[PDB]
């Protein structure tokens, strides 16, 4: 069945190589793509090869690459290998691009995901020369049907001078209808519109991205796979974390501080957040609803078991095997899923209005419950802040989840001082590790420290943390948030110097 | 007569007697925001009784939850009496600050727009007492607030017992200036759409609502608000304002702002005063305020017509300005709206209106993470206040500061901030008396080049550049380069020696 149902537009079909020639050195390129889903594939590859050739002849050839969130090997991977990206935003998980960023070869800024469209419209990234968007289909009236994510695609189509569409036959035609694309002003010039979403399952828009056909400079027929890593099957550590959190939710419900169906759930990036969902799929909370950034394997499992009724997100982040299950059963799942623009899924006003429960992973927290989501030793990027700030600050309850140690016990995930802060104390109420759960509500920073050290820290590190805190209480400049600045970052330096935070 | 409900007159009683309603261990929610509209006589009486108990070996402390900062009669008196075991969300009293920094009062500085919601969630415990200052009580038992709204409606809803102070010092014509909504802003989810699409829009009514059966005492008072002295702009503040106004002018000439700018949020003090004086004289028109506070300079622009409306939760005026507004309250009442702080500080509304946020800071690191609160990482100044509410939600987030503190002995730009309140993602523009750093579109290393070159003081720039250069060469990763062995060392140098500037009797890499 012809994917390009608008006859006139079929005359714009051309090779990926010729299409990549539309992209010039210095160009700002906005693309589809969010958590390994729905990014363009063939045009980036052809661009990457031409970049390598140009570099060899001594011609500069780099672009600024602005996305929804993370992409995949065919985009971030290929372009990073070609050394073809001078600036990248807002979120990356590709290892080659991460290495470019941590070597200082690609400039990176990890914006709050819900803010990226608004900053793009403001002009922070410069003028958009190109929008490169992957599509399932092009309707008879010229609407662009997105694929496995929505992300920022509508904004990039609005802003870009020229548009390139990759129509990917690999993507399931039955995705058509799953998306909700709103006509209103969420991220445009102030004053913005009221966004009328008052329930997580409410559709307010239409199934297609809109674009003036005169801006479409090329359409490329493609055939290639989305690719994501699988999730870790929940091990004893993740299962322990899920157990503590489910017990916690149970107590909240019994104290009537949550409804029996809880509140709309946001589940973050990563293996731990995913294991919580596996716990919920057989849990005592029925008729759950998701209002999230992404739908991971665990959430799809909850939809399968019936524990969750509907899930809202901007994207799928499915393992290879989960992605294949939803495609065989898109009829069952299409009615249970709404894919929204990321400036709507990650809207702080909507998140607060709905009363979302935020569950997110973390690199580390300090004893006062400030959280690092991003920068190992303070300087080495992992992935990026993503939507964790959008949700942590706006949520009804902000929960952070992590193994109490990393790197086989050589790093403590609870430290005297975080080497970088993404989420301040005010934005984190509940911490869970395999050691236990710290409920920080109502507590001052020294009271937070008592709870975090005693409930969450690993036994190998808890005495060292207690020693730091007790001596800080005695000798610190002020006693509101006691620190010893001579040793606050010393565990991190010890890791850099010796490969472990444990003293000899 | 200020109490126009006859039945409620029977609940009038002396401050001392009313204070006896407040028991050891009680959670007390009070009016009060930026030194305005807090209760005065009952806290004074309570403090006396607290001290008397303590002298006899009897415990007597409360948990004190407010709108924001109060004044000497409340935070001051109770701190002197050592009568507060927990305080939230925001304090500026010196005595209370000392209790907090000694560990004698537990403190948590919540985002101001979130406090009502967390109170309803139960995070502070069950409220035993609401103690609220009023201008008047209407015929149907409505409570007219005074010079701030703050969290008073939420505290009235939650408290077991209510005490009202009716203050004849407060102008009767304040009645009508407030907008109090009965909609669900901070209650149980799902909350209501807050339908504000203009800074001058009213959604509620003029009074706080409370079941009269919960009113245990009404106290007649006559006492002044804090009314801190006017902070006359010095040359540093005037330079900062000059760079900022030049930036606004350029944004307008590039069509990235309207000639009327966008709704403005500013703080209080030296620099904010200079900015407001600059706006009064600048090439802009039809300005609008959507802020936490009304300050002296705003009255000036509302009078001239330069500003069309100002929205806030409170007044923060000098004695001169307080006198000007009371002599002309009928005029200014038509130009000002005072809202609940969970509405003035609503992130959804701030974003929707596209506010420009202008906030102070203790320090920023070279990558443009910002400390608003904790000197050396451990000593509380005031609190985060509404700065997070506004910085994260704003159309443009601007931080303004002298480039040095303590007579040059501290750099306000440091290798690493000792505490973070506002992450890089929440700060786009920095202004000091040295210049303006526009960070839009930049990675952290690019932010550092701009902050060091534009904002740092000449006495500290070579040291900052030296840290940055060596971190670029040696850091674990190069995305946000640091040297962890010395990242906090300027702070420790200050703790140990009283200055961040080194001595030439030892090696320092920038010296060579
Ligand atoms: C609403 C949007 C949500 N988005 C976000 O939260 C984005 C930011 N968050 C994230 O990137 C992830 O949640 C985190 C923080 C990386 C945690 O991921 P996760 O729950 O899968 O954690 P997990 O324990 O499996 O570790 C993931 C990686 O981080 C590493 N890591 C985790 N904690 C660490 C620590 N304290 N020190 C060093 N490395 C650490 C860990 O070693 C692993 O890397 P490698 O595979 O060894 O190269
Ligand atoms: C929309 C809500 C706005 N609310 C907020 O921003 C609340 C948090 N902000 C604040 O408390 C204030 O903006 C700040 C951060 C204290 C800055 O205050 P300000 O702009 O009036 O600046 P100013 O230079 O007068 O300094 C205030 C105090 O902090 C001190 N200070 C400022 N920077 C400092 C630094 N880098 N190191 C040490 N002390 C510093 C300064 O010495 C003064 O202390 P004293 O009263 O003399 O003991």
| The three-state (H, E, C) secondary structure of A392-424, written as one string | HHHCCEEEEECCCEEHHHCEECEECCCCCCCEC
Q: What are phi and psi of B48, to 5 degrees?
A: -65, -45
Of B160, B159, B70, B73, the residue nearest B116 (C-alpha): B159
- Name the helix (H) or strand (E) containing B145: strand B143-145
Q: Alpha-carbon torsion A242, A247, A250, A255, what sign?
A: negative
Please enumerate in sequence order all residues whose Cβ is within 8 A of that of B327, keeping only pairs 6 or more positions apart, or say none.
Answer: none
Of B451, B247, B449, the residue nearest B368 (C-alpha): B451
Q: Where are the domains of chain B?
A: 1-512
Of B38, B365, B81, B266, the residue nearest B170 (C-alpha): B38
Give Cα B496 distance to the centre of its chain: 31
- Name the helix (H) or strand (E) containing B356: strand B356-359
Burial class (CB in 10 A: 0-12, 13-18, 19+), A463: exposed
Method: X-ray
d(CA A364, CA A458): 13
Would you call A353 and B190 a contact, using CB atoms and an 8 Å cutoff? Answer: yes
Would you call A444 and B86 a contact, using CB atoms and an 8 Å cutoff? Answer: yes
Burial class (CB in 10 A: 0-12, 13-18, 19+), A227: middle
**Nearest residue (CA) to ligand 2, atom 38:** B375
Give Cα B64 distance to the centre of its chain: 17
Count of residues for chain A? Answer: 504
Please list, residue by residue across B234-265, b when 16 or more beta carbons sit within 10 angstroms of its beta carbon and e when fewer do. Answer: eebbbbbbbbbbebbeebbeeeebeeebbbbb
Would you call B193 and A353 a contact, using CB atoms and an 8 Å cutoff? Answer: yes
CB atoms within 10 A of CB A7: 9
Residue with tokens 């080194």: B502
Q: Are B447 and B395 in contact (CB under 8 A)?
A: no
- Name the helix (H) or strand (E) containing A250: helix A236-254
Q: Nearest chain B Cα to A493, which residue?
A: B484
Cα B493–Cα B496–Cα B498 angle in degrees, nearest 5: 75
Q: Are strands A337-340 and A308-313 parallel, antiparallel or unpaired?
A: parallel
- Ligand 1 pocket (Cβ < 6 Å) reads A 266, 268-272, 293, 360-364, 373, 376, 382-383, 386-388, 391, 403, 406-407, 411, 413
Q: Alpha-carbon torsion B180, B183, B189, B190, what sign?
A: negative
- Ligand 2 pocket (Cβ < 6 Å) reads B 265, 267, 269-271, 292, 359-363, 372, 375, 381-382, 385-387, 390, 402, 405-406, 410, 412
Please enumerate in sequence order all residues whose Cβ is within 8 A of that of A372, keeping only pairs 6 or more positions apart, or say none.
Answer: A362, A363, A364, A365, A418, A419, A420, A421, A422
Among the bound ligands, the one closest to the CA of B401: 2
- Helix, strand and coil in chain A, % to nearest 5: 35, 20, 45
Return the number of CB contacts < 8 Å for A and B.
231
d(CA A419, CA A403): 18
With contacts defined as CB-CB under 8 Å, which chain B residues touch A480? Answer: 100-101, 103, 107, 374, 378-380
Q: Are A157 and A131 in contact (CB under 8 A)?
A: yes
Cis peptide before B222 (omega within 30 of 0): no
By most ligand atoms within 8 Å of CB, the mutation choice from B380, B403, B405 for ligand 2 is: B405
d(CA B106, CA B99): 8
Q: Alpha-carbon torsion A108, A114, A120, A124, what sign?
A: negative
Q: Which token pair is B80?
A: 């002197």
- What radius of gyration, in Å, describes the C-alpha atoms of chain A? 23
Question: B314 by DSSP, 3-state: which?
Answer: strand
CB atoms within 10 A of CB A32: 32
* HEC secondary structure over A55-99: HHCCCCCCEEEECCCCCCHHHHHHHHHCCCEEEEECCCCCHHHHH
Of A422, A392, A266, A353, the residue nearest B342 (C-alpha): A353
Of B30, B36, B28, B93, the residue nearest B292 (C-alpha): B36
Beta bridge partners of B310: B289, B336
With contacts defined as CB-CB under 8 Å, which chain B residues touch A421? Answer: 369, 420, 423
d(CA A55, CA A470): 57
Q: Which token pair is B110?
A: 């919540």
**Nearest residue (CA) to ligand 2, atom 19:** B360
Q: What are phi and psi of A269, to 5 degrees?
A: -70, 135
Question: B26 by DSSP, 3-state: which?
Answer: coil
Question: B107 by DSSP, 3-state: which?
Answer: strand
Q: Are strands A137-138 and A144-145 parallel, antiparallel or unpaired?
A: antiparallel
Give Cα B83 distance to the centre of its chain: 23
Beta bridge partners of B137: B3, B143
Distances (CA, A) of A301 to A274, A279, A319, A402, B179: 10, 10, 12, 21, 47
* HEC secondary structure over A329-394: CHHHHHHHEEEEEHHHHCCHHHHHHHCCEEEEECCEEECCCCEECCEECCCEECCCCCCHHHHHHH
- What radius of gyration, in Å, describes the C-alpha atoms of chain B? 24
Q: Are B90 and B68 in contact (CB under 8 A)?
A: yes
Active site residues of B: 292
**Nearest residue (CA) to ligand 1, atom 18:** A270
Would you call B487 and A492 a contact, using CB atoms and an 8 Å cutoff? Answer: no
Contacts with A, B 249-288, CB within 8 Å: 256, 262
Q: Which token pair is A408?
A: 């086989």
Give Cα B479 distance to the centre of its chain: 33
d(CA A118, CA A211): 18
Give Cα A143 distance to the centre of its chain: 27
- Indicate the resolution in Å: 1.5
Residue with tokens 């040291």: B463
d(CA B343, CA A170): 48
Among the bound ligands, the one closest to the CA of B372: 2
Contacts with B, A 301-360, CB within 8 Å: 348-349, 352-355
d(CA A176, CA A179): 7
CB atoms within 10 A of CB B502: 16
Question: B436 by DSSP, 3-state: which?
Answer: strand
Q: Are A278 and A234 in contact (CB under 8 A)?
A: yes
d(CA A432, CA A466): 18
Burial class (CB in 10 A: 0-12, 13-18, 19+), A2: exposed
Of B40, B48, B55, the residue nearest B168 (C-alpha): B40
d(CA B248, CA B229): 29
């Amino acid at each position: 069945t012809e994917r390009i149902r608008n006859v006139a537009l079929r005359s714009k079909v051309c090779p990926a190589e010729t299409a990549s020639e539309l992209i010039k050195h210095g160009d700002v390129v906005g693309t589809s793509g969010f958590t390994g889903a729905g990014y363009p594939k063939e045009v980036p590859k052809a661009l990457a090869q031409r970049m390598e050739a140009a570099h060899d002849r001594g011609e500069k050839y780099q672009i600024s690459l602005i996305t929804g969130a993370s992409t995949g090997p065919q985009l971030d991977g290929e372009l990073a290998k070609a050394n073809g990206v001078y600036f990248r935003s807002p979120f990356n998980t590709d290892a080659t691009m991460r290495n470019r960023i941590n070597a200082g070869e690609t400039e990176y800024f990890d914006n709050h995901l819900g803010q990226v469209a608004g900053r793009a419209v403001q002009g922070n990234y410069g003028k958009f020369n190109i929008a490169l968007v992957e599509a399932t289909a092009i309707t008879e009236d010229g609407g662009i049907v997105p694929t496995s994510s929505v992300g920022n695609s509508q904004t990039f189509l609005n802003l870009a001078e020229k548009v390139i569409i990759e129509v990917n036959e690999w993507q399931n035609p039955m995705l058509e209808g799953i998306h909700d694309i709103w006509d209103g002003n969420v991220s445009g010039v102030p004053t913005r519109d009221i966004v009328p979403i008052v329930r997580a399952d409410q559709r307010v828009g239409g199934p297609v991205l809109r674009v003036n056909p005169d801006k479409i400079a090329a359409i490329v027929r493609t055939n290639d796979r989305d690719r994501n890593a699988p999730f870790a099957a929940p091990d004893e550590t993740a299962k322990a974390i899920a157990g503590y959190l489910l017990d916690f939710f149970g107590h909240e419900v019994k104290q009537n501080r949550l409804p029996p169906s809880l509140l709309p759930l946001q589940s973050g990036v990563g293996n731990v957040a995913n294991a919580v969902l596996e716990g919920l799929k057989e849990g005592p909370f029925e008729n759950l609803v998701g209002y999230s950034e992404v739908i991971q394997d665990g959430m799809l499992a909850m939809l399968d078991s019936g524990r969750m009724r509907i899930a809202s997100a901007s994207s799928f982040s499915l393992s290879p095997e989960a992605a294949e299950e939803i495609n065989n059963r898109m009829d069952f799942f299409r009615s249970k899923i709404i894919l929204r623009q990321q400036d709507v899924s990650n809207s702080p006003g909507i998140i607060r209005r709905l009363g979302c429960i935020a569950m997110n992973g973390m690199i580390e927290a300090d004893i006062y419950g400030n959280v690092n989501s991003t920068r190992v030793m303070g300087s080495k990027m992992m992935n990026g802040i993503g939507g964790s700030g959008d949700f942590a600050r706006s949520s009804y309850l902000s929960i952070f989840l992590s193994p109490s140690t990393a790197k086989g016990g050589k790093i403590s995930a609870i430290v005297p001082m975080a080497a970088h802060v993404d989420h301040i104390m005010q934005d984190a109420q509940i911490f869970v590790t395999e050691q236990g759960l710290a409920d920080l509500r109502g507590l001052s920073p020294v009271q937070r420290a008592r709870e975090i050290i005693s409930k969450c820290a690993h036994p190998d590190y808890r005495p060292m943390l207690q020693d730091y805190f007790d001596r800080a209480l005695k000798n610190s400049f002020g006693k509101h948030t006691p620190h010893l600045l001579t040793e606050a970052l010393s565990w991190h330096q010890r890791f850099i110097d010796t490969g472990t935070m444990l003293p000899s």
